[PDB]
Amino acid sequence: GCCVCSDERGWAENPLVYCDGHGCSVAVHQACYGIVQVPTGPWFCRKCESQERAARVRCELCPHKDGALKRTDNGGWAHVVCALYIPEVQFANVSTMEPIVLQSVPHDRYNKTCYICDEQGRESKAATGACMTCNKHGCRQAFHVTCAQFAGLLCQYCGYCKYHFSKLKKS
Ligand SMILES: [Zn+2]
Ligand SMILES: [Zn+2]
Ligand SMILES: [Zn+2]
Ligand SMILES: [Zn+2]
Ligand SMILES: [Zn+2]
Numbered sequence: 001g002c003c004v005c006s007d008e009r010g011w012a013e014n015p016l017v018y019c020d021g022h023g024c025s026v027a028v029h030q031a032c033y034g035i036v037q038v039p040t041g042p043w044f045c046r047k048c049e050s051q052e053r054a055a056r057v058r059c060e061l062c063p064h065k066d067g068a069l070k071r072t073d074n075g076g077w078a079h080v081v082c083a084l085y086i087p088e089v090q091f092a093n094v095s096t097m098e099p100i101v102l103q104s105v106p107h108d109r110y111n112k113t114c115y116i117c118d119e120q121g122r123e124s125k126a127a128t129g130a131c132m133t134c135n136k137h138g139c140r141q142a143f144h145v146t147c148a149q150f151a152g153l154l155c156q157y158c159g160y161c162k163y164h165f166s167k168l169k170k171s
Pocket of ligand 3: 059079
C-alpha cells in the first residue's frame with residue numbers, strides 16, 4: 001500500500017503512485033507525498049532522484065531505512081510519516097510537503113527512549129532520533145513514529161503504547 005498512511009488503494013482524485021527507481025519499494029498517495037500533478041511517465045521518489053551517498057539518504061528522526069523521504073531544513077532527510085506525527089515538525093510548503101522543517105522541534109522530542117526499539121533488539125537505537133509520546137495523559141511511554149507505525153499503534157495524528165492501545169475498546 002502507501003508508505004505513509006494506512007490506505008491500501010488510491011482514489012481517482014488521489015492515486016497511489018509507485019516509485020520506479022531500482023531497488024526501491026516506495027509507494028505513496030499523491031496527497032501523502034505532496035505530488036503536484038501525477039506523472040505521465042515513470043515516477044521517482046526524492047531518494048531515488050538524489051545523487052547523494054546512499055548511506056546518507058535516510059531519516060534522521062528514526063532508525064528505519066528507506067520509506068518515503070523528503071529533504072529537511074538542516075541539510076538532511078526525514079520520513080514524511082515521522083514529520084506528520086511529531087507535533088512540532090513542520091513543512092515549508094504543506095502542499096508540496098517539503099522541505100521538512102526541524103528547527104522548532106524541542107529538546108523534549110530528542111531526550112526520550114523508544115520502548116519499541118528496546119523490545120525489538122534495537123537498544124543502541126532507542127535513544128536516537130525523535131519520539132512521539134503515548135496519547136494517554138500520564139503515560140511516559142515514548143516511541144519512534146515508524147516503530148509505532150509497524151506495530152499498528154498510530155491513529156488527530158497521535159498514537160498509543162501497546163498497553164494503552166490494548167485497553168481501548170475498538171470501534
Ligand atoms: Zn497514503
Ligand atoms: Zn524511490
Ligand atoms: Zn523516520
Ligand atoms: Zn524505535
Ligand atoms: Zn501509554
